[PDB]
Structure 1
Amino acid sequence: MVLSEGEWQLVLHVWAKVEADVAGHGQDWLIRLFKSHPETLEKFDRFKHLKTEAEMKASEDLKKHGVTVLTALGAILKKKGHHEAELKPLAQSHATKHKIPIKYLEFISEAIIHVLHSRHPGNFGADAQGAMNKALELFRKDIAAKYKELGYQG
């Protein structure tokens, strides 16, 4: 898969707006994921005790992890496809330590797209969503290939 420069520009233009509020977007993403696919919460021993959205919103720890997740994804997107080095440690920890199936990476992709559509309607029209979806599909394709090399089905 290869995105054109035009597609990367649509992706990075909305990401520039996302970076004006890293903590807010990171939190919104994880909460949307947990609300839409509750089974994903079970993978986090650190957060699985949270019972309601209100408890999730109030968790400083969950906000801190959201910042970590968003910042890591941002570093990969800014590479515009040349992200092999960034992907290795992430594939290794998620395949071997956390044991995150590819299906859950699809769910988190859906959650980021939903939050960007809600917060940035003017910069996240059809073409921009199409470009972001292609960028996340590329990320998932490459992570899946690494999972296979590492011995995890995903």
Structure 2
Amino acid sequence: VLSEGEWQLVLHVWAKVEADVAGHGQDILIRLFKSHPETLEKFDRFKHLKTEAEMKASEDLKKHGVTVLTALGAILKKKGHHEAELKPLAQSHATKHKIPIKYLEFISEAIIHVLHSRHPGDFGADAQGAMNKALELFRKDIAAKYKELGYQG
């Protein structure tokens, strides 16, 4: 469990992400795709993109980054009481999009890196530790749903 102090660190940095949801979202997806090119192949929508400049120029990619971060923010603001928000996401990602849990680890690393880049004053080691713990909780709960449905591996 995260303590209340740990959740406060998470949500204090998240409030700053919300000042520029589209810019953060774009940066996170591009870092994922560049660091782990296998992930791009899961997106029929985006797999025509071949350079960082092309990724940065895509309005549709920017729009999807907003969708991703909006959903993640709604989960974080539940402070662990996220069953209703998380279940539908797990179901779509396991059974429709066919995303392995390992790729959820990769996007978690991309989020942490981008937050460090953009918010160094509010994203010290104590806040990095708290954010890691929040994203671990997210992954643990998705993995349980995957296991029920026959997708943990």
2-structure distance, mates of 1:127, 1:18: 17
Q: Distance in 1 between matches of 2:75 and 2:150?
A: 23
Query: What residue is the counterpart of 2:142 in the other structure?
Result: 143
1:77-111 C-alpha deviation (Å, 9 max, x unpaired): 00000000101110000000011001000000000
Shift of 1:13: 0.2
In 1, the alpha carbon distance for the partners of 2:50 and 2:22 equals 21
Using the TM superposition, give the Cα deviation of residue 153 of structure 1 relative to its aligned residue in structure 2, in angstroms: 2.2
Cα distance per residue 1:110-135 (max 9 Å; x no partner): 00000000000000000000000000
Distance 2:90 2:15 in 1: 25
> Where does residue 90 of structure 1 map in the other structure?
89
1: CA distance, partners of 2:87 / 2:145: 7
Runs of 5+ consecutive residues of structure 1 not aligned to the other structure:
none
Which region of structure 1 is more displaced relative to structure 2, 134-143 or 144-153?
144-153
Per-residue CA shift, 1:30-73, capped at 9, x if unaligned? 00100111110000000011000000000000000000000000
Aligned to 1:7: 6
Query: Scaled by the length of structure 1, what TM-score is found?
Result: 0.98
Distance 2:134 2:33 in 1: 22
CA distance in 2, matches of 1:44, 1:72: 18
Q: CA deviation at 1:149?
A: 1.0
Distance in structure 2 (CA, Å) of the matches to 1:132 and 1:124: 9
Percent of aligned pairs with the same amino acid: 99
Q: Displacement of 1:150 after TM fit?
A: 1.6
Poorly superposed stretches of 4+, deviation over 3 Å? none
CA distance in 1, matches of 2:51, 2:27: 14
Superposed counterparts of 1:1-154, under 5 Å: 2-153=1-152
CA RMSD, 1 decimal? 0.6
Query: Gaps spanning 5+ residues in structure 2: where?
Result: none
CA–CA separation in structure 1 for the residues paired with 2:105 and 2:87? 19
